[PDB]
Amino acid sequence: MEKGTFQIKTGFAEMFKGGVIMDVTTPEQAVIAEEAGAVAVMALERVPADIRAQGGVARMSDPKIIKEIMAAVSIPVMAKVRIGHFVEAMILEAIGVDFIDESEVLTPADEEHHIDKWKFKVPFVCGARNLGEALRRIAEGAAMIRTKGEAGTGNVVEAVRHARTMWKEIRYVQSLREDELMAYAKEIGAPFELVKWVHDHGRLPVVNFAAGGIATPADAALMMHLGMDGVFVGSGIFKSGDPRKRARAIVRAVAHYNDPEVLAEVSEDLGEPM
Amino acid sequence: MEKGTFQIKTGFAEMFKGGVIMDVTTPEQAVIAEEAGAVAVMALERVPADIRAQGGVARMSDPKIIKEIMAAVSIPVMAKVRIGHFVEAMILEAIGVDFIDESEVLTPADEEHHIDKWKFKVPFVCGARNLGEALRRIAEGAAMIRTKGEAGTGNVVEAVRHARTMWKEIRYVQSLREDELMAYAKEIGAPFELVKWVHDHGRLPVVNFAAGGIATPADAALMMHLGMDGVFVGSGIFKSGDPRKRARAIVRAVAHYNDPEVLAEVSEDLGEPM
Amino acid sequence: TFQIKTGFAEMFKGGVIMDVTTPEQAVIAEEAGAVAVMALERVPADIRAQGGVARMSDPKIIKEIMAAVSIPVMAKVRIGHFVEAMILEAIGVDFIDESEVLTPADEEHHIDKWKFKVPFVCGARNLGEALRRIAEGAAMIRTKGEAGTGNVVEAVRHARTMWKEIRYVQSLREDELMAYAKEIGAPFELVKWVHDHGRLPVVNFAAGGIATPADAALMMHLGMDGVFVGSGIFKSGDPRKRARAIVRAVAHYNDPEVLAEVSEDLGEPM
Amino acid sequence: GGMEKGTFQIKTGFAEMFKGGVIMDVTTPEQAVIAEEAGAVAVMALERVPADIRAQGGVARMSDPKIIKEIMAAVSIPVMAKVRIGHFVEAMILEAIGVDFIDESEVLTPADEEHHIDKWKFKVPFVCGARNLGEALRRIAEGAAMIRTKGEAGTGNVVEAVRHARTMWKEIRYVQSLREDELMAYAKEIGAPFELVKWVHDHGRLPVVNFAAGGIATPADAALMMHLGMDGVFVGSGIFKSGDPRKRARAIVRAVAHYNDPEVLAEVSEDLGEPM
Amino acid sequence: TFQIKTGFAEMFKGGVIMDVTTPEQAVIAEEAGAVAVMALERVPADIRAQGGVARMSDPKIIKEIMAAVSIPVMAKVRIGHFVEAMILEAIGVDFIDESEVLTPADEEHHIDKWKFKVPFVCGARNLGEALRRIAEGAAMIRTKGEAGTGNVVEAVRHARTMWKEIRYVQSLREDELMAYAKEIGAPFELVKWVHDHGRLPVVNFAAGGIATPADAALMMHLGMDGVFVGSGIFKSGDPRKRARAIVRAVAHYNDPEVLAEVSEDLGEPM
Secondary structure: OEEEEEEEEEOOOHHHOOEEEEEEOOHHHHHHHHHHOOOEEEEOOOOHHHHHHOOOOOOOOOHHHHHHHHHHOOOOEEEEEEOOOHHHHHHHHHOOOOEEEEEOOOOOOOOOOOOOHHHOOOOEEEEEOOHHHHHHHHHOOOOEEEEOOOOOOOOOHHHHHHHHHHHHHHHHHHHOOHHHHHHHHHHHOOOHHHHHHHHHHOOOOOEEEEOOOOOOHHHHHHHHHOOOOEEEEOHHHHHOOOHHHHHHHHHHHHHOOOOHHHHHHHHOOOOOOO | OOEEOOOOOOOOOHHHOOOEEEEEOOHHHHHHHHHHOOOEEEEOOOOHHHHHHOOOOOOOOOHHHHHHHHOOOOOOEEEEEEOOOHHHHHHHHHOOOOEEEEEOOOOOOOOOOOOOHHHOOOOEEEEEOOHHHHHHHHHOOOOEEEEOOOOOOOOOHHHHHHHHHHHHHHHHHHHOOHHHHHHHHHHOOOOHHHHHHHHHHOOOOOEEEEOOOOOOHHHHHHHHHOOOOOEEEOHHHHOOOOHHHHHHHHHHHHHOOOOHHHHHHHHOOOOOOO | OEEOOOOOOHHHOOEEEEEEOOHHHHHHHHHHOOOEEEEOOOOHHHHHHOOOOOOOOOHHHHHHHHOOOOOOEEEEEEOOOHHHHHHHHHOOOOEEEEEOOOOOOOOOOOOOHHHOOOOEEEEEOOHHHHHHHHHOOOOEEEEOOOOOOOOOHHHHHHHHHHHHHHHHHHHOOHHHHHHHHHHOOOOHHHHHHHHHHOOOOOEEEEOOOOOOHHHHHHHHHOOOOEEEEOHHHHOOOOHHHHHHHHHHHHHOOOOHHHHHHHHOOOOOOO | OEEEEEEEEEOOOOOHHHOOEEEEEEOOHHHHHHHHHHOOOEEEEOOOOHHHHHHOOOOOOOOOHHHHHHHHOOOOOOEEEEEEOOOHHHHHHHHHOOOOEEEEEOOOOOOOOOOOOOHHHOOOOEEEEEOOHHHHHHHHHOOOOEEEEOOOOOOOOOHHHHHHHHHHHHHHHHHHHOOHHHHHHHHHHHOOOHHHHHHHHHHOOOOOOEEEOOOOOOHHHHHHHHHOOOOEEEEOHHHHHOOOHHHHHHHHHHHHHOOOOHHHHHHHHOOOOOOO | OOOOOOOOOHHHOOEEEEEEOOHHHHHHHHHHOOOEEEEOOOOHHHHHHOOOOOOOOOHHHHHHHHOOOOOOEEEEEEOOOHHHHHHHHHOOOOEEEEEOOOOOOOOOOOOOHHHOOOOEEEEEOOHHHHHHHHHOOOOEEEEOOOOOOOOOHHHHHHHHHHHHHHHHHHHOOHHHHHHHHHHOOOOHHHHHHHHHHOOOOOEEEEOOOOOOHHHHHHHHHOOOOEEEEOHHHHOOOOHHHHHHHHHHHHHOOOOHHHHHHHHOOOOOOO
16 A cells, blocks of 8 residues: 655744734834734735725735835734735745735735645745635645635624634534545545544644634634634724724733633723724 | 423513613713613614614724713613624623623624523623514523614614514414424424423513614504513614603603503604604 | 433334234244334335325234234324324333324324323434424434335435534534524524533434345444334245344444354345 | 644555456356456456346345355455445445455445445455546545446446546546646546645556446457556456357457457457347 | 548449448349448447447458458448447458447547548538548548438438538638638638638538438439438338439439439339
8 A cells, every 4th residue: 555645834823822913014013013912913015905995906015115024023024925926925935024825815816726835935824714725725735724704894703704614614524423524525625634634633733813804802802712823903903093002902802812801901992993 | 201401591671671771872861861761771882873874893882981871870781792792792791781782783793693691690682573583592591682673764663563573473372282382483493492481471581672763752652562561762862852851751651651641742842853 | 491201212222123014023023132013004115105095003903913022012103193192002002103104194293292101203314303303202213214115325314414413513612502403493402402412312223224234234333223124024035034134233233244144145135 | 833744545556466357247156257267357246237126226235145155166366246335334244255355336226325435444445436537536535446437337338438438537647737736726626635636646647446347348348448548347247148158258358458459359359249 | 731531432422332231232232333332230220219239240240241242341330439440440341430320439539530541431410520520530421311210301401501611611701711610610721621622622422311212313413422321222122123223313313314214113112
């Protein structure tokens, strides 16, 4: 019998567990995010949600602005690339970003293929709405997963659906008989060997963050209760009264998601949401 | 032959029977409501109907606003949370609200699951359009039910439909043979054990209020004639000219719903509605 | 508060219940090792196939079978025919099968089984159906499988489906149970029970299409507590041999050697 | 950040001994002997012809161990037997009595319409049917040690076997031609296990022996399947009902062994009698 | 650069090719004036009508026919069955008919005829189909017509259609040829060839449903180069007479008097 092999890019995002990653468009916002306790920042030249709302094309940000943000903080810096645009990824890797987000929020560059992430040293985070999608991204080399949620609305409903769905399926796979795994793998279009891995471990092999629609500290804590490892939040934070306060509030809510007293405290006099 | 047991959050809203609960956005309005005779107030930082109209997301109100209202009156204070947002509920419970309304008027946070209300000490009120919905909410731990009615229109037609429907079904269940209960329970998607309870008692195990579209004293009294235990009325009272007058009028109409002389008196020179 | 009619079918675990139409077949079944027999005046599948109405069997025939063996005797009633059930209870049957194989007497309601002292077994194709029957008072469940074909495919589907759902329910978060219960039309309180125990509160047997020793053992591997087999055993050629073979296959379902042994020179099935 | 080492297996090395050969369905020891003397590389033991049972509207199951053992004692070449799809207990029995290969056959009445047998739980190797690459790889991922086209049963029409053989190969060669970054999309498209798709991309062939089956009625048909890239063929018991069982069986064996020799093919096709 | 397998069927122009199932029929066909015979062990139409699979005939029967006559002998193979073709070529047939009347062996691909020395005849219902077959290597084309009915209506449709399209292609502007080629799914280079010559590059025969002398002559008037006729000639009553009648009708297709003469007292057709 022949022995086949495959890999899983593990250990790259564990450092972010229990934390918040914040979108930032300027070095000033990056500084505020770091001071507020963000575990990493997502550098953006312009808010993708704003671009698509205007019917424009959202692409990789200019290296100039990404570098400026990298020079402003000490925490990890992530940046986005269009789905399938492996050259944009080559560029981000070259300038030294710590993580690349192959994001559906930017305008897809390839509507059939995602990036061959195994061809890169730099780790990637990819979006998913269910287990099948998550496992396909991981099979391609993804080192982190995040819910797709809903972009540009501030409505947490889809993030909740994706979080609950991914976990319902993970726990279901773990509960299935070994002889029932292939049929299920085919049903959800998930790579078989990874389905077997999930059956044996009862979790995803990589960190899984909530993203899209997280607008309040309550929303962030809700995602932690739903089994997510942390959350990504948008630049809306720096678009309301005291951005420093809401940013810190979300960081604290994620760190103490099971403490009602803390959650109530950080939610008080928080100002207008996005 | 094993024997199981289930619970029912009873005895929490009986103190509101025969009364009116008013939506309030400021301490000043809360004071007016209390002076008018309201049995409780519903604290809101902003009218959810207004937010939906603007296509925005309606969420739990800022604790600061809720606390200010709590400090202004002696009657019970309720507040709303989005459907399925159990963390918003954790927060409201922590700040000391007397009742939580898991409201469909706010933007649903979970389109598949409602809050596991048994995990809270604070009682919940939930909306329903029929018996099946009412019993599912009660099975989840609801301590009070209200019609969903129609919000932001001032049209009582849906509240009438919901009130009549719930009661037609309650009385029908009571009229059914014991051997016909399972088929009906399945038909309306209602928890079997609660259907049996309703069959034996001929009513819901918790207080059932009218809500959504009650704009005039006549509307309020109409709901009492249709078998409801009381009514919830919106902040529209504090904008329809001389809020104090219409507020007292509705309270008196509910208290004397079977007295045409009183109903005529309080309806006269009441001013523009909504 | 609610109840669950438990403790009535546990005695049948690991066993085979055989359909019998005569006292002679009943004796053969008992001698073969059957844990109980299902008395039938005529094979429902035959009647149904002939387009006729299949009902409760004549008490005379059931009594003759009861007097021929010492093991429990079951009999069938049409779905919703609670008077047929009153009659079977009165004559002393040990278990009643509210069977979909007989012609349904009520297309809307099943029997209010709580009104009887005698235990009932009901069929199910999934968890929702099983829990509804249990909520009505059923003390035992069986797969509906497929009747009158000898094809085990549906019994396999039902067995696997009920178990996939049971294990899924156990895996669900407590706050996700109501939505699921509503989805499969299952009594909420029983769903919570299954969530806490990871199994059905009553014995669950395979039935419908079990034609060979291999089929019977297969059902045990799929998590069933035993099997019901049709009167086809007394026609295939050697009744005593195939009957004993199925009994032994269930008792040794995890032993390939024994399974191979009892399957050899077994003549031809139904 | 590191790389967790994942592993998986492929049941290779079990069917190579059959390459370039013919496997024949036999219902009696006498036919088994004829098949072996004709040059068959293995025989498929059957108590009754599945196609006939199905046509008669009956249920086709695993054969009685008695008849399988009788066939095993009559020949020296490997003996295979069939089980219904998903019937792992029938498989446990065949393994126990010593069959050399198990055919999880769609020709028998499926026992599980949702799941195939967890073949990794067996020592004895399995051959499974497939109509395309996706199906073939799913069966291999489940542990299959050999694949065969499904073809068409009970008709003697080779058209479907041709379609399956050509389709599996078109897909295999296409996978090999694809860019590495285009493999996941294709794997998803055909419902094929991704790691095996990558394996096929690197090797340009199926990881296990692939035989033609279903509808192979004449020496010309058998040779055709070899030209289409198959490793051998499975033929039905129709050979024992034509006229000269020995001649017919020998003709197929020689046609497969010399599929690229027009003269041999013409020779063995002459005065061969009516098929089936 | 490309090729066209021309020059192989010209010898058959103005003639009749007859289906024969025995050496005796072959002799009758040759004596009647047939330019070639199509050897068949069994009538495909009969087999197909009986729901059976029609394949290449046994080499034994084909050889017996080859040894009985001096004129060319053709034989059929199933569509896409290139091994059957390898066999027919090996035994020395003069022409192979990749026939739709036999049961197709490949529903997607026809035989790569360029890989054979022996010429092939293929059927077609229109110009696109004819050109695709020719592009694959066909050295002769025939209408598909309708088999096993004796109804000439489809042969007429196919003959008229192929010619309407050929003359249309010749009438088209050079800049309109690509769009048309795409429209009828025809190889572009061959379309340009037809545009320049106003005919097919290979012999085109009528076939399928030619039952009477009048039918045969009709096909010649419609621009066909000759006709293929079924073995029905040897059953209608007097084989030698009807066979000779069809041969003479084709040779004198424009002579009403001869056509009337050979049609008289011809017994009854298929």
